[PDB]
Amino acid sequence: QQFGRDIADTTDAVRDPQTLEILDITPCSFGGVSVITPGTNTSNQVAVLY
Amino acid sequence: SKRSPIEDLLFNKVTLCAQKFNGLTVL
Ligand SMILES: *[C@@H]1O[C@H](CO)[C@@H](O[C@@H]2O[C@H](CO)[C@@H](O[C@@H]3O[C@H](CO)[C@@H](O)[C@H](O[C@H]4O[C@H](CO)[C@@H](O)[C@H](O)[C@@H]4O)[C@@H]3O)[C@H](O)[C@H]2NC(C)=O)[C@H](O)[C@H]1NC(C)=O
Numbered sequence: 139q140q141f142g143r144d145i146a147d148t149t150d151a152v153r154d155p156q157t158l159e160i161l162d163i164t165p166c167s168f169g170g171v172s173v174i175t176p177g178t179n180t181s182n183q184v185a186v187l188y
Numbered sequence: 189s190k191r192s193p194i195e196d197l198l199f200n201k202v203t204l205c206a207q208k209f210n211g212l213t214v215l
């Protein structure tokens with residue numbers, strides 16, 4: 139075998155064609171950014187949540 | 189665990205991946 143799949147039918151493991159080694163695949167850190175504010179009337183400081 | 193014997197029995201029966209891909213997130 140040479141490929142690697144899962145239930146979702148998405149490639150997640152690749153065999154090295156040179157040294158015959160089984161690698162791994164993972165998406166690199168996607169997400170959403172949100173801010174936290176106590177109300178612009180009281181102050182003007184915020185915090186950031188990733 | 190801070191559950192009760194009935195709660196413990198319930199939580200051990202609900203048992204039936206999908207980490208992250210194609211913009212699918214679970215809050
Ligand atoms: C793909 O082509 C390459 C081109 O030659 C080929 O790589 C080389 O293969 C030879 C044998 O076929 C390797 O020679 C030995 O390989 C063994 C197993 O990997 C190593 O353990 C040996 O080196 C060890 O000992 C050294 C001295 O103690 C250490 O310094 C070293 O770090 C190791 O511990 C020995 O080298 C050769 O290493 C490879 N070359 C590389 C860069 O890996 C390869 O075999 C071809 N692949 C296929 C599937 O045909």
Ligand SMILES: *[C@@H]1O[C@H](CO)[C@@H](O)[C@H](O)[C@H]1NC(C)=O
Binds near residue numbers: 179180
């Ligand atoms: C902002 O907060 C203060 C707190 O005393 C309040 O008096 C004021 O009315 C607030 N600003 C507005 C626009 O309501």
